[PDB]
Amino acid sequence: GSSGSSGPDGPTQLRALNLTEGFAVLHWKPPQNPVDTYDIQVTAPGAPPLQAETPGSAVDYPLHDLVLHTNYTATVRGLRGPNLTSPASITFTTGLEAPRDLEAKEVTPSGPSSG
């Protein structure tokens, strides 16, 4: 019942913003208290592992060199002292722009005949 609004020490409510000119980036909400460094981990089934970091003075980390047709899983964290914060993962495709690819069906059923 009684559910108040509060935020952890790390990034939460991770959402996938609209990519730009084929640019995939992460978006997290800064908790009451800002962290020092955010630990992000990008991985996928087959794709090479990617590791990076960003200063607490940042609320977004744009990832590049991502395979369009490939789901890259990122995991952001919050480095607060000798301890860590709650990790935040989200699924976002690196391909949200193409002609007659998403809207169209692009299906051509072949049904010839003979006799």
Features:
115 residues, mainly beta, Immunoglobulin-like, five-stranded antiparallel β-sheet, Tenascin-X
Short description:
The chain is mainly β.
Polypeptide structure, described:
It comes from Homo sapiens. Appears to mediate interactions between cells and the extracellular matrix. Substrate-adhesion molecule that appears to inhibit cell migration. Accelerates collagen fibril formation. May play a role in supporting the growth of epithelial tumors. Residues 11-97 form the Fibronectin type-III domain. Glycans are attached at residues 18, 71, 83. Belongs to the tenascin family. A hairpin with a 6-residue loop joins β3 (37-43) and β4 (50-55). The protein is elongated, with a radius of gyration of 20 Å. It has one domain (9-96): Immunoglobulin-like. The chain has strands at 12-15, 24-29, 37-43, 50-55, 60-63, 71-80, 83-84, 88-93. 16% of the residues are buried. Strands 3, 4, 6, 7 and 8 form a five-stranded antiparallel sheet that branches. It is an all-beta fold and 115 residues long.
